[PDB]
Structures are given as C-alpha cells and as structure tokens.
Design a protein around this nucleic acid. Structure first.
Ligand SMILES: [Mg+2]
Ligand SMILES: [Mg+2]
Length: 58
RNA sequence: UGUGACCGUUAGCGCAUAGUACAGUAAUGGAAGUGCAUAAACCAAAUUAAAGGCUUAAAUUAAAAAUAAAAUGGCUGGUGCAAUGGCACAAAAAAUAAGAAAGUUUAAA
C-alpha cells in the first residue's frame, strides 16, 4: 500500500545508543561552546528537546 | 621583541602558579586543581495484550499554516571547541679577555 503507511522507526539497542547519537551530542556541545546560550541555534535545540520530553508522557 | 607541518589541563615547565598543601628530626622528596555540554562501567524501576452487520444519487475547498516516541532517573567527567599557560631557537642588548706591575699605547674632524 505504500512506504508512508508501512514505515516504522527501529528501536536502538541500549548498548548501541552512545554510537547512534554521537554526532548530535557533539553538535550541541559545539554550538554552546562557540555561540553561547543566547543564540538562535541554541534556542532551536531547546525547542526540539521540549518536544521529546512531552512525548514521554503517554 | 620575532618565527613554528611545537603542546592544548593524564598534553606542554613540578606549577593555566606552587616549590604551596602534605611526608620526614634533618638534608631532601613533592601533588591535585580551567570554562561549557543526554559518553562508559556502575545501582533501582520497567514481563504479558483483548474487540465481528445503520437503510447510501448531487458534499467541501480567499490563500496559506496546523495531528506520528530514534533518547528513564541518577552518579561520574571522557570526548569535542577555545586560550590571560608552557616548549625550541633566532634578532638586539648585556656579560667576558688582556703584555706590563706604584709609569706613558687606541685620539676621527
Ligand atoms: Mg578536558
Ligand atoms: Mg600538568
């Protein structure tokens, strides 16, 4: 019936999570170290984190 | 002062100040310690999955926007980025030598 209908996100094994998110963690450190917390890039990251936390409540 | 296919907090000086704290009767020996951010070991919590019958022929839409889990809570301080700290010599300056012994030299207009 199509990709959109049957698409699913795989679950990362607990032991492999430090490798799946290595790049994202580095970027956040890169932004805060160079641009600071009062930056447009920093605000975007925080907004994305709010979305993740809100979805934990199910 | 100048330069670097020299280092970037387990590195580079022992020291991003400290020959301090501390050990020793003494001579002496001699640390740890920058700023920011979901790394690892590590301890607690999280098992499972069910559903069986409204009668169908003239809607809506300025425009645009707006429905979906990659990630538990902690303790710890690795990695990534930056330098009011170090390393090596170079340039300039400084230091340095006289034969004689109570004696004369070396001064550019
Ligand atoms: Mg560090
Ligand atoms: Mg050191």
């Amino acid at each position: 019936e199509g990709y959109v209908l049957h698409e699913k996100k795989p679950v990362v094994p607990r032991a492999l999570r430090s490798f799946a998110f290595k790049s994202q963690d580095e970027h956040k450190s890169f932004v805060l170290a160079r641009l600071g917390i009062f930056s447009e890039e920093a605000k975007k990251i925080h907004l994305n984190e709010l979305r993740t936390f809100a979805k934990r409540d199910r």
